[PDB]
Amino acid sequence: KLFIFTTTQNYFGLMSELWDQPLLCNCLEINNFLDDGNQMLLRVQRSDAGISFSNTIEFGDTKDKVLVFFKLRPEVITDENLHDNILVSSMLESPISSLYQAVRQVFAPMLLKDQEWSRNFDPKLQNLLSELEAGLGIVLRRSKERANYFKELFETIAREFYNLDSLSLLEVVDLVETTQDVVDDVWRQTEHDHYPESRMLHLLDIIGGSFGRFVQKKLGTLNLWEDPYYLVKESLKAGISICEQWVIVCNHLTGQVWQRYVPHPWKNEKYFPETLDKLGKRLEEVLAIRTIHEKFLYFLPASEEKIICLTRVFEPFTGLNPVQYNPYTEPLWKAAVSQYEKIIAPAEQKIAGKLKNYISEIQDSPQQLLQ
Amino acid sequence: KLFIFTTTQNYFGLMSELWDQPLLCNCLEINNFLDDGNQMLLRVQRSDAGISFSNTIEFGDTKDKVLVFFKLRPEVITDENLHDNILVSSMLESPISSLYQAVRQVFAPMLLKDQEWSRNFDPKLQNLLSELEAGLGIVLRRSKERANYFKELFETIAREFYNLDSLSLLEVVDLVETTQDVVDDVWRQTEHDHYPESRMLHLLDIIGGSFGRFVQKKLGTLNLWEDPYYLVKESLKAGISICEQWVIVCNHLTGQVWQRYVPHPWKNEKYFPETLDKLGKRLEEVLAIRTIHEKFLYFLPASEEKIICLTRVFEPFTGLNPVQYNPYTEPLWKAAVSQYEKIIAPAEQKIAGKLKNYISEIQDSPQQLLQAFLKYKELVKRPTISKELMLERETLLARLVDSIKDFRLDFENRSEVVNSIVWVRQLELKVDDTIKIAEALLSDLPGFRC
Amino acid sequence: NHFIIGTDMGLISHGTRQDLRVAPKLFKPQQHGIRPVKVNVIDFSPFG
Numbered sequence: 049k050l051f052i053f054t055t056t057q058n059y060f061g062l063m064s065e066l067w068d069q070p071l072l073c074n075c076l077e078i079n080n081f082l083d084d085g086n087q088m089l090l091r092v093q094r095s096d097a098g099i100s101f102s103n104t105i106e107f108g109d110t111k112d113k114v115l116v117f118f119k120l121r122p123e124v125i126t127d128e129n130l131h132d133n134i135l136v137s138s139m140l141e142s143p144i145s146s147l148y149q150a151v152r153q154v155f156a157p158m159l160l161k162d163q164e165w166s167r168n169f170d171p172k173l174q175n176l177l178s179e180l181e182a183g184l185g186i187v188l189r190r191s192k193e194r195a196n197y198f199k200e201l202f203e204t205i206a207r208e209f210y211n212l213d214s215l216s217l218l219e220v221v222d223l224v225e226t227t228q229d230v231v232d233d234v235w236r237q238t239e240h241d242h243y244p245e246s247r248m249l250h251l252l253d254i255i256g257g258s259f260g261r262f263v264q265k266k267l268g269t270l271n272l273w274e275d276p277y278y279l280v281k282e283s284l285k286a287g288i289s290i291c292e293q294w295v296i297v298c299n300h301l302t303g304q305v306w307q308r309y310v311p312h313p314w315k316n317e318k319y320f321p322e323t324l325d326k327l328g329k330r331l332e333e334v335l336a337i338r339t340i341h342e343k344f345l346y347f348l349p350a351s352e353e354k355i356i357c358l359t360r361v362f363e364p365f366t367g368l369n370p371v372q373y374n375p376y377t378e379p380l381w382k383a384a385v386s387q388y389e390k391i392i393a394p395a396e397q398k399i400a401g402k403l404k405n406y407i408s409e410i411q412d413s414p415q416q417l418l419q
Numbered sequence: 420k421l422f423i424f425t426t427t428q429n430y431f432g433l434m435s436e437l438w439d440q441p442l443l444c445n446c447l448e449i450n451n452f453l454d455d456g457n458q459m460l461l462r463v464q465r466s467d468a469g470i471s472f473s474n475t476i477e478f479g480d481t482k483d484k485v486l487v488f489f490k491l492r493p494e495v496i497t498d499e500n501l502h503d504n505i506l507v508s509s510m511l512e513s514p515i516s517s518l519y520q521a522v523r524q525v526f527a528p529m530l531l532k533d534q535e536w537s538r539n540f541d542p543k544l545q546n547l548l549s550e551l552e553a554g555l556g557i558v559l560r561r562s563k564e565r566a567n568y569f570k571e572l573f574e575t576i577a578r579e580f581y582n583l584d585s586l587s588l589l590e591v592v593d594l595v596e597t598t599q600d601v602v603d604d605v606w607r608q609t610e611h612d613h614y615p616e617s618r619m620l621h622l623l624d625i626i627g628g629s630f631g632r633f634v635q636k637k638l639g640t641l642n643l644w645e646d647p648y649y650l651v652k653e654s655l656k657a658g659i660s661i662c663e664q665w666v667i668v669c670n671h672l673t674g675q676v677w678q679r680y681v682p683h684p685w686k687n688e689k690y691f692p693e694t695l696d697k698l699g700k701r702l703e704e705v706l707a708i709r710t711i712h713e714k715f716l717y718f719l720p721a722s723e724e725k726i727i728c729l730t731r732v733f734e735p736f737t738g739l740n741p742v743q744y745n746p747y748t749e750p751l752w753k754a755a756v757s758q759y760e761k762i763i764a765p766a767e768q769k770i771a772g773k774l775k776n777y778i779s780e781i782q783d784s785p786q787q788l789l790q791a792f793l794k795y796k797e798l799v800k801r802p803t804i805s806k807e808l809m810l811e812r813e814t815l816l817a818r819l820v821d822s823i824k825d826f827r828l829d830f831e832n833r834s835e836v837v838n839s840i841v842w843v844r845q846l847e848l849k850v851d852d853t854i855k856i857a858e859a860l861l862s863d864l865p866g867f868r869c
Numbered sequence: 870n871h872f873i874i875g876t877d878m879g880l881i882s883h884g885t886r887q888d889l890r891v892a893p894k895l896f897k898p899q900q901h902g903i904r905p906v907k908v909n910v911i912d913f914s915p916f917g
Contacts, residue, residue: 054434063425063502064436083745084639085632089524107533113503118524120511122632126747131430132484135509139525143533147526147544153459153489154508155518162476162514169554173518176554180547183540253539261536323542357888364585376531376545593894848904 051130052078052090052101052117059115059138060094074101081117082124090117109141148184151177194239201234202251209255212262217286220262224294227255232301236309248312249319252298256320259294260327263287267331268371273363277338284331291328295320326375333385337362344395350402354395362388422501423449423461423472423488430486430509431465445472456493463488480512519555527552565611569618572605580626583633588657591634595665598626599672606680614681623673623690631694634661638698639742643705648713655706662699666691701744708756711797715766722769729763770798771807778811785818792860805862816866819853826850875908 053066070078078101081090091105093114105116118135125133140146156177163170209227212220235248242248267287270280298320306312344355368384375381410416424437441449449472452461463472464485476487486509496504510517526548534541576598579586586594602623608614638658643651669691678686712733715726739755774795781788792812798804799812826846833839861867873896875881881896898904 050434051429054429058426058429059502059507063421065434079741080743083741083748084743086636105528105532107529116525118520122628123743123745124747126745131434135484135511136430136486137508137521137525138506139529141533143530147529149489149491149506150525153491153506154487155522157460158476158487159514159518162478164478164514167515167558169558173551173554176547176551180544180551183543187540257539258537321542353887353889357890360888364582374542374545376549589892589894 049075049078049082049130051134052081052092053099055115055117055136056092056094056099060092060099060113072099074099077101077103081119082126082130085122088119091115092117107141107143111145112141114139114141144184144188148181148188151184152181156181197239198243202247205230205234206251206254209258212258213265217263217266217283217290220259221286221289221293224259224290225297228294228297228301231255232305232309235305235312237311242310242312245313248310252319253321256294256298256324259290260323263290263324263327264372272334272338272371273366277342281335281338284335288328288331288335291324291331295322295324295328327373330369330373330375337366337388344399347399347402351395351398354392354398358392358395361391420446420449420453420501422505423452423463426488426507427463427465427470427486430507431463431470431484443470445470448472448474452488452490453495459490459493461488462486478512478514483512485510485512515555515559519552519559522548522555523552562611565613568610569605569615572601573622576601580629583630588637588654588661591637591661592657592664595661595668599668603672603676603680606676608681616681616683616685620690623669627669627691628694630665631692631698634658634665634695635698635743638702643702644709644737644740648709651709652706655702655709659699659702659706662695662702666693666696666699697746698744701749704752704756705740707797708759711763711801714795714798715763715770718770718773721773722766725763725766725769729766732762733759764803767798767801767803768807771801771804774798774804774808775811778808785815785822788818789815789856789860793856799860809864812861813864813866816857816861816864819857822853823850873911875911877905877907879903879905879908881908881911 049070053070057064057066077090080103081087081101087103089103089105091102091114093100093102093109093112115136115138118137120133120135124130139150156174159170159174159177212223215223231252235243267284270283272280272284274280299318302318303316307315341355341359344351348355365384365388369381407417420439420441424441428435428437448461451458452472452474458474460474460476461472462474462476462485463470464480464483465471486507489506489508490504491506492504495501508521510521530541530544530548576594579594580598583591583594602619605619606614638655641651641654641658643655645651670689670693673690674687677683677688715722715729719726736755736759739751741752744752778788778791781791788811792799792815799808826849830843830846833842857867870886871883872885873881873883883892883894883896885891
């Protein structure tokens with residue numbers, strides 16, 4: 049209540065001591081920050097002639113300046129000064145400028161100079177920071193008869209495409225094929241040898257990424273944990289087909305489109321990051337897990353104990369790869385899958401025994417054996 | 420020339436404005452920071468009765484606190500406020516730890532949260548930040564059958580250790596017992612003679628600290644003052660049970676394994692801060708206060724007029740019962756309790772009257788009479804009620820005197836040896852129970868001593 | 870599917886058949902030591 053307010057004034061308002069009048073609703077969040085051994089952060093923001101403290105950090109602001117407090121020790125030592133156990137760092141509420149300035153001004157030169165000779169991975173971290181701030185700096189600094197035709201033609205196609213969320217998974221499985229064809233056709237040598245590369249790739253990148261966001265949202269609305277798996281399986285398979293089909297046609301057709309219809313500088317090369325590929329695999333793993341479980345369910349009298357118990361054991365494991373998944377912490381899921389394979393095994397062992405008896409009982413009848 | 424010094428004072432020294440006396444040798448580096456379009460940084464550190472400003476960043480010190488100034492613009496605009504174009508960031512004297520926490524806490528959630536679903540090129544920034552924080556975490560944290568044994572035993576229980584949020588109070592109790600057994604096995608030196616004393620002591624400290632914080636985390640959320648006393652005391656006591664058991668078991672069993680599993684110079688020593696012990700005391704205080712109020716309500720006809728007035732004052736007291744009981748600030752509640760205790764005393768005397776009748780109404784059966792005294796623990800411990808009903812408890816003591824004499828006579832009357840052993844064991848249990856209860860209920864009354 | 874088992878050592882354990890980790894606790898009075906009371910009759914209250 050001394051350092052917290054003093055720093056707030058020093059950065060936001062008058063560079064002086066705030067009167068000892070802790071009669072604000074924000075005093076609770078301050079007291080939580082200090083006393084609660086879990087609250088390692090506290091945000092402060094200057095309001096309209098007001099001060100607002102909150103443990104929650106939010107980024108709805110456009111280009112405002114905020115300051116966040118950071119704790120060193122589990123709990124504050126009240127007897128000691130409130131500036132000997134807490135760090136401060138300011139930051140702008142700008143998704144581009146804040147990262148650019150923060151990294152460029154603080155982190156890049158800090159790592160370059162402030163490095164211990166005995167610590168590794170420093171040269172890699174340095175390269176990462178350089179590439180990062182470079183990309184941000186680029187973004188931070190940012191006959192009409194043919195031009196009109198191009199705008200009207202591709203704007204029409206784009207607007208027809210943009211109504212994508214209105215389509216179900218079972219329908220977009222076919223749209224991926226139609227969209228790839230029509231977009232590659234319109235790029236052809238119609239009114240000009242070749243339209244500037246800018247849109248030539250940008251539109252396809254939007255369309256590909258749009259399918260990604262589309263499938264990510266639509267698979268979430270299936271509730272890939274509830275009882276009506278019958279309908280989920282149908283829609284899920286469609287989601288995979290969307291993801292894989294687009295990637296396949298992109299990689300194949302691009303090779304010939306840029307050689308036959310539009311004299312584009314790129315030849316026998318692809319463009320698409322293939323983020324759908326990872327999303328498709330994600331759903332495939334889910335389908336395989338759910339399918340195996342249903343197969344065990346048919347044998348429920350054989351592995352009753354395993355099936356019932358493991359269902360709830362594996363639920364917190366699945367929670368490591370939620371709906372609308374993005375593989376930016378993928379190692380966490382890898383750990384979940386490793387445990388899945390090691391814990392489900394008793395089920396496989398008991399069923400393996402049953403299957404051996406049930407199959408070997410077949411008196412070498414090729415028909416029954418195959419089935 | 421205002422922000423640089425004023426901020427230094429606010430963080431390092433006195434929380435006040437420095438007099439306008441820029442007559443220090445360090446003023447040159449400060450002036451360079453302001454005027455030089457190249458010097459985008461300036462570190463400040465408080466030395467022994469000194470302040471040192473320099474763009475140079477160093478980590479020669481061990482655990483000091485420093486601050487570095489950063490500009491947004493190449494040059495300071497003196498016309499504009501001198502605190503609207505300069506940012507600061509503090510750090511500890513660790514070139515790796517500072518970067519790890521700063522990046523993880525700031526950038527990782529910044530990009531992930533502050534993102535439009537339709538905006539591209541962010542996937543690259545995401546991957547960069549992921550590798551960035553990963554490499555920082557990796558370095559910060561940095562035959563084989565020995566290490567593998569340790570890891571297998573650790574992971575057996577580390578899964579929950581690192582994911583306790585998903586458990587509940589009952590599971591925590593089980594975890595306390597479970598964990599002790601698992602770690603005890605790690606002291607075994609049969610897979611490999613090597614045993615890393617320092618690793619076990621460090622790990623136990625880490626587990627104790629984090630686990631303790633967890634327990635109080637869950638307890639804090641209960642809001643243990645609501646009307647459903649039944650649920651309050653149930654969950655409350657669970658927290659106490661966790662606290663007491665964990666402290667007792669960890670300290671006792673640790674002191675044992677140091678000499679039993681590994682014949683180490685250590686034995687019978689404490690290795691835990693016992694934060695849960697303090698928590699348990701706080702929980703007991705909340706139970707006592709919440710309970711004695713409920714007891715007043717149970718006996719409400721005795722002093723109804725007082726309970727009404729006491730409730731109205733009890734409420735603003737209860738408002739001073741926070742959670743996350745930081746021992747540094749606990750006097751706030753203690754003062755509230757003191758005032759609470761002072762004002763409820765007139766009701767306690769009226770209750771003592773009702774209790775005198777309540778006990779008198781009970782048939783002369785030592786069981787039910789004793790149980791009534793043992794049941795109403797909070798009320799008996801009241802100085803008023805204790806004095807007022809001392810004669811009845813003294814009578815029950817005389818009854819206990821008879822009880823042991825009866826047991827004595829059965830004792831004096833005493834293959835078949837097995838049954839004798841069982842019989843005398845039963846006598847021990849009965850007599851021991853009596854003296855233990857009597858001590859509590861008679862408040863060490865001289866009659867008890869005999 | 871749930872059941873309890875008593876032993877001569879003066880304790881009663883809980884368990885079940887399907888999910889063997891629901892609440893693997895034991896029952897004990899507010900006592901200490903062992904008290905091997907040799908429990909010999911167990912029943913259930915036939916109500917909700």
